Ligand binder design. Structure first.
Ligand SMILES: *[C@@H]1O[C@H](CO)[C@@H](O[C@@H]2O[C@H](CO)[C@@H](O[C@@H]3O[C@H](CO)[C@@H](O)[C@H](O)[C@@H]3O)[C@H](O)[C@H]2NC(C)=O)[C@H](O)[C@H]1NC(C)=O
Ligand SMILES: *[C@@H]1O[C@H](CO)[C@@H](O[C@@H]2O[C@H](CO)[C@@H](O)[C@H](O)[C@H]2NC(C)=O)[C@H](O)[C@H]1NC(C)=O
Ligand SMILES: *[C@@H]1O[C@H](CO)[C@@H](O[C@@H]2O[C@H](CO)[C@@H](O)[C@H](O)[C@H]2NC(C)=O)[C@H](O)[C@H]1NC(C)=O
Ligand SMILES: *[C@@H]1O[C@H](CO)[C@@H](O[C@@H]2O[C@H](CO)[C@@H](O)[C@H](O)[C@H]2NC(C)=O)[C@H](O)[C@H]1NC(C)=O
Ligand SMILES: *[C@@H]1O[C@H](CO)[C@@H](O[C@@H]2O[C@H](CO)[C@@H](O)[C@H](O)[C@H]2NC(C)=O)[C@H](O)[C@H]1NC(C)=O
Ligand SMILES: *[C@@H]1O[C@H](CO)[C@@H](O[C@@H]2O[C@H](CO)[C@@H](O)[C@H](O)[C@H]2NC(C)=O)[C@H](O)[C@H]1NC(C)=O
Ligand SMILES: *[C@@H]1O[C@H](CO)[C@@H](O)[C@H](O)[C@H]1NC(C)=O
Ligand SMILES: *[C@@H]1O[C@H](CO)[C@@H](O)[C@H](O)[C@H]1NC(C)=O
Ligand SMILES: *[C@@H]1O[C@H](CO)[C@@H](O)[C@H](O)[C@H]1NC(C)=O
Lengths: 209, 317, 167
């Protein structure tokens, strides 16, 4: 809902697509205006050059206009071909984003926006595509005690899930992304190597549930 | 590049003829202006990936890992890292040409770079979702290892070795870049191509394009005015063709440079501000970490990966 | 507008730090543009600095707010352009705007780290780019930040797909 309010009050928000339609309109307006140019010739008007000058000279002046107009057209075509490459690249990226964030769930970093990707929805648009990319962002970054492992019976215990944390009295394992602690238990740890292997290892209780 | 200056030197007789060609020249100015705007966008897309500026803390308590060769040097005029000094030390008019500075300069790029490096070192992938989180360097490695299918126990058994291997690899790159400047050729080519495009216009400017004289003051004093005007139109067409060729080349190159900037921006997000699973994307090996560097009109990254030491034969089922 | 022994151009001619053989008379740049002359009578080497040129960039407020406009002259010193509110930027000579020592975000770009905006009693101000707020994150090797709760943000992204089918 906030996006809809934003797009309504701030139309410039859609400028990336407005620019496409503006560039093509300008390319056409450019040819039409250049068409009236004489390109240094006696007259840019064909009926006028033919009635004004004896035919063999009018033909020379016509070749000057033809070259100038053909140059305007080649410039236009070149610009449209370069832009076609740019538009195709954007279309390829847009197609990629639809597949990656709408019809599947991509792990690409910040690909469809900052946050953890959750879901995405396409919209049609005048000569373009608009997507609403929905992501998660953490609400509050709280400070906890940590360790790479804790040990018991002289051996190092590592998480099979997430990260080992502490509140100052007990050790818990949370998710990599969120602070939802489990008491450390034997059933959810990996044991390998001596306690002394891990730098920063803490001596603590691993519970039997 | 402005036709008035390039072609006439602001002189009246050819200027009036240029006005008759009109938008035929002003469209060249629009194309080049558009490219210049995109060049600032490219720099920003590649380096301004931090919403806040992050800094390395006063004490580098990073588990034995030396990031001092990638992080900026506080004592210098420009806050460049030791490796950036190598990158910058090795990679390098009234003719209508105006050249403008970037909005985002080497010093400001270095400030974004410092934030990007501080980010990957102390926050890693958490930098990709909201305010970055604080993680001990060895814990950051635990996540980086688990992310490639290797249990964190592995890094602890080898932490001393990992720190030594990392520190050595960064140092060897600096020695390589110092003795072999051609190593940075992919960027040296960019600056060389643009210099050549400009040198090409300046040299073509002296051409008569088959006309009686390429010098404007000379054609005007040499020939009766109505003929001089014809010879001037020949020079104007030839110069406009040189300018259109230049603009076309800069537009095609702008598409190529933008594609490289997009890839560079992608690599920073994928290997520096998160940990991508793309195959061989930032180099051969298992991706571990990556560090950006600023560069003269480009970006350089050190992509750090793991490679197995010895492929032993075991029975399987 | 100079003419030395038949060789011409327009510029500012000052003492050069170049040396030459007694033999030589002119210096040359790409495509044989003269970049130095020796005077025909005075035995001094003089450096030709092309006469200054650049575009004119106008700093415009939203017109839905005010009529306060400053002008940036590219590739020129404020010795050659001025007015009363005259400040030199790295990009060019800026007239009508004031300068502030503090850094801020960037609304209206000048170049070389300098960017303008409007602040209040409103005026046109050139600022140092801040590149964003600083985040003074504390750090240790035995503590970790792990968040509690999350929210949803949605990014609106617009991409080009097609062009007008012209012929
Ligand atoms: C062309 O003629 C001019 C005269 O207008 C010559 O300049 C003159 O050069 C002589 C010899 O250096 C100067 O005499 C001495 O000059 C020095 C320093 O200027 C001074 O300390 C001495 O007391 C003595 O006057 C003379 O002043 C100078 N005149 C001027 C107006 O500069 C010039 O050398 C000739 N150029 C060539 C290439 O022959
Ligand atoms: C850390 O969390 C543990 C949870 O295991 C806390 O221990 C509990 O304390 C509550 C009351 O504070 C008791 O009701 C539970 O019986 C305790 N559980 C166990 C397993 O002893 C501990 O108090 C917390 N420490 C701090 C400093 O907050
Ligand atoms: C890690 O960085 C520190 C920076 O203080 C290194 O100490 C100096 O590093 C420079 C260049 O890296 C050398 O030229 C000096 O010989 C080093 N020692 C001094 C000034 O006493 C330190 O060597 C680095 N640690 C490594 C590479 O393992
Ligand atoms: C794993 O590989 C590393 C690096 O190849 C080995 O570490 C080296 O060990 C030698 C012992 O001869 C030392 O001289 C080097 O200083 C070590 N290098 C580093 C970078 O630490 C290590 O021996 C290998 N481990 C096993 C079990 O093969
Ligand atoms: C949790 O860690 C964060 C790291 O961002 C702390 O934020 C900084 O902490 C230092 C000292 O703890 C302060 O001097 C800075 O002013 C803080 N910077 C910012 C941008 O907030 C935060 O204070 C820590 N929280 C607790 C309760 O210790
Ligand atoms: C990193 O963790 C280590 C422990 O693995 C800390 O080292 C000791 O920490 C204790 C209590 O914090 C201190 O009493 C000792 O003086 C520390 N020894 C050393 C050699 O520092 C270390 O303090 C932690 N680092 C940070 C920056 O918090
Ligand atoms: C933790 O256990 C290890 C066993 O390797 C031992 O070396 C160490 O002294 C113990 N630490 C404490 C504080 O008891
Ligand atoms: C012109 O401004 C530049 C800033 O790059 C400065 O270096 C130079 O001294 C100035 N020149 C004059 C004559 O003020
Ligand atoms: C900005 O810095 C200059 C040079 O040090 C100083 O003269 C001036 O007073 C400063 N202005 C402000 C507003 O601090």
């Amino acid at each position: 809902g906030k996006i809809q309010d934003s797009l309504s009050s701030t139309p410039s928000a859609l400028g990336k697509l407005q620019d496409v339609v503006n560039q093509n309109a300008q390319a056409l307006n450019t040819l039409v205006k250049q068409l009236s140019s004489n390109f240094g010739a006696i007259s840019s008007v064909l009926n006028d050059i033919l009635s004004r000058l004896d035919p063999p000279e009018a033909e020379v002046q016509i070749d000057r206009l033809i070259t100038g107009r053909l140059q305007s057209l080649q410039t236009y075509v070149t610009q449209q071909l370069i832009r076609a490459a740019e538009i195709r690249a954007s279309a390829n990226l847009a197609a990629t984003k639809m597949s990656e964030c709408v019809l599947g769930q991509s792990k690409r970093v910040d690909f469809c926006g900052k946050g953890y990707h959750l879901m995405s929805f396409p919209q049609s648009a005048p000569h373009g595509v608009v997507f609403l990319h929905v992501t998660y962002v953490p609400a509050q970054e709280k400070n906890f005690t940590t360790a790479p492992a804790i040990c018991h019976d002289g051996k190092a215990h590592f998480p099979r899930e997430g990260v080992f944390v502490s509140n100052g009295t007990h050790w818990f394992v949370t998710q990599r992304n969120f602070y939802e602690p489990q008491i450390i238990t034997t059933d959810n740890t990996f044991v390998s190597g001596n306690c002394d292997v891990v730098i920063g290892i803490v001596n603590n209780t691993v519970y039997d549930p | 590049v402005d036709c008035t200056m390039y072609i006439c030197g602001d002189s009246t007789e050819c200027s009036n003829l240029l006005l008759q060609y009109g938008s035929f020249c002003t469209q060249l100015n629009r194309a080049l202006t558009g490219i210049a705007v995109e060049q600032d966008k490219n720099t920003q897309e590649v380096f301004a990936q931090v919403k806040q500026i992050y800094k390395t803390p006063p004490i580098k308590d990073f588990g034995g890992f030396n990031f001092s060769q990638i992080l900026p040097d506080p004592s210098k005029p420009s806050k460049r890292s030791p490796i950036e000094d190598l990158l910058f030390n090795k990679v390098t008019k009234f003719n209508g040409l105006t050249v403008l500075p970037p909005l985002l300069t080497d010093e400001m790029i270095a400030q974004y770079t410092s934030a990007l490096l501080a980010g990957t070192i102390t926050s890693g992938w958490t930098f990709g979702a909201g305010p970055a989180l604080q993680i001990p360097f060895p814990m950051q490695m635990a996540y980086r290892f688990n992310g490639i299918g290797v249990t964190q126990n592995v890094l602890y058994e080898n932490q001393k070795l990992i720190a030594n291997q990392f520190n050595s690899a960064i140092g060897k790159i600096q020695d390589s870049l110092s003795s072999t400047p051609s190593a940075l050729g992919k960027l040296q080519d960019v600056v060389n191509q643009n210099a050549q495009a400009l040198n090409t216009l300046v040299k073509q400017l002296s051409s008569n394009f088959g006309a009686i004289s390429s010098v404007l003051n000379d054609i005007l004093s040499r020939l009766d005015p109505p003929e001089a005007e014809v010879q001037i139109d020949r020079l104007i067409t030839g110069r406009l063709q040189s300018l259109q060729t230049y603009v076309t080349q800069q537009l095609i190159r702008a598409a190529e440079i933008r594609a490289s900037a997009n890839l560079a921006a992608t690599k920073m997000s994928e290997c520096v501000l998160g940990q991508s699973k793309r195959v061989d994307f930032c180099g051969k090996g298992y991706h571990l970490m990556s560090f950006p560097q600023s560069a003269p009109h480009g970006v350089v990254f050190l992509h750090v990966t793991y490679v197995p030491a010895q492929e032993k034969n075991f029975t399987t089922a | 507008n100079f003419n030395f022994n038949g060789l011409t151009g327009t510029g500012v001619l000052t003492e050069s730090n170049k040396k030459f053989l007694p033999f030589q008379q002119f210096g040359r740049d790409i495509a044989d543009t003269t970049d130095a002359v020796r005077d025909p009578q005075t035995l001094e080497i003089l450096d030709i600095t092309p006469c200054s040129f650049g575009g004119v960039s106008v700093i415009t407020p939203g017109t839905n707010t005010s009529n306060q406009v400053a002008v940036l002259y590219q590739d020129v010193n404020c010795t050659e352009v001025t007015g009363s509110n005259v400040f030199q930027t790295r990009a060019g000579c800026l007239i009508g705007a004031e300068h502030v020592n503090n850094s801020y975000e960037c609304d209206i770009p000048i170049g070389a780290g300098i960017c303008a905006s409007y602040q209040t009693s409103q005026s046109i101000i050139a600022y140092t780019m801040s590149l964003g707020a600083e985040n003074s994150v504390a750090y240790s090797n035995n503590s970790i930040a792990i968040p509690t709760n999350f929210t949803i943000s949605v990014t609106t992204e617009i991409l080009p797909v097609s062009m007008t089918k012209t012929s």
